[PDB]
Amino acid sequence: HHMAHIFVYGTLKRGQPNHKVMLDHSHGLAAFRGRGCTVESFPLVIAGEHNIPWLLYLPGKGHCVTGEIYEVDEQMLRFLDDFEDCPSMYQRTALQVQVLEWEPGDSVQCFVYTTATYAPEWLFLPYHESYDSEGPHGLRYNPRENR
């Protein structure tokens, strides 16, 4: 079957708190392909009570956002849609990604979880080039069922 390229910038990245879900074969297949940055700039904010990273769908604002390129199967793609609570919390959007390292040419089209349903005040939060839950912003990810 065909596969699909995705680009992850947040908790799904290697070394980030939700990476395990991509390594769990009960969800399908995800193969690491390399590192990239969005060709278009977008705001990346760490926001809400869970300190979740959100790539806001405001093309041309903020910065090119760095992340990782994976090739995934359809099962994994649908799992990630459910994981990200699409289309309410995030909407899956196809974006051009400049390839910085490859394990394809200069860029690759990838699905990315963006959001148009952010809280409006999140526009005033810092806009990140990259996400690290343990970064100096001091806002560590906490899991969804925490109150």
Closest C-alpha to 36, from 142, 147, 111, 121: 111
Give the pair of three-digit tokens for residue 103: 């394990």
Give the length of the chain: 147
Q: Is 84 a catalytic residue?
A: yes
Q: Assess contact for 21 and 83: CB atoms under 8 A.
A: yes
In sequence order, the β-bridge partners of residue 130 are none
Give the tokens for residue 122. 């999140």
Q: Which residue has the tokens 């990273």?
A: 53
Measured between alpha carbons, how far is 120 from 135 in angstroms, rounded to an integer? 24
What is d(CA 91, CA 134) in angstroms, rounded to the nearest whole number? 26
Write down the catalytic residue from 71, 84, 101, 121: 84
Query: Experimental method used, please?
Result: X-ray
Q: Which two tokens stand for residue 1?
A: 């079957």
**Rounded distance between C-alpha atoms, residue 14 and residue 147, angstroms:** 26
The pair of three-digit structure tokens given for residue 143, joined into one six-digit string: 């899991």
E strands, the chain, in order: 4-8, 30-38, 44-47, 52-56, 66-72, 91-102, 107-115
Do 42 and 97 touch, CB atoms closer than 8 A?
no
Q: H helices of 30-146, where?
A: 74-83
> Quick one: which of 28, 49, 26 has its CA closest to 122?
49
Q: CA 90, CA 57: separation in Å to the nearest integer? A: 10
What residue spans of 24-141 are helical by DSSP H? 74-83
Annotated binding-site ranges:
9-12
Q: Which residues are annotated as a binding site for substrate?
A: 9-12
Q: DSSP secondary-structure letter at 61?
A: S
CA 124 to chain centre: 20
Domain count, the chain: 1
CATH number of the domain at 14, please.
Answer: 3.10.490.10
Domain assignment of residue 143, given as a range: 1-147
User: Cβ–Cβ contacts within 10 Å for residue 72, how many?
Assistant: 22
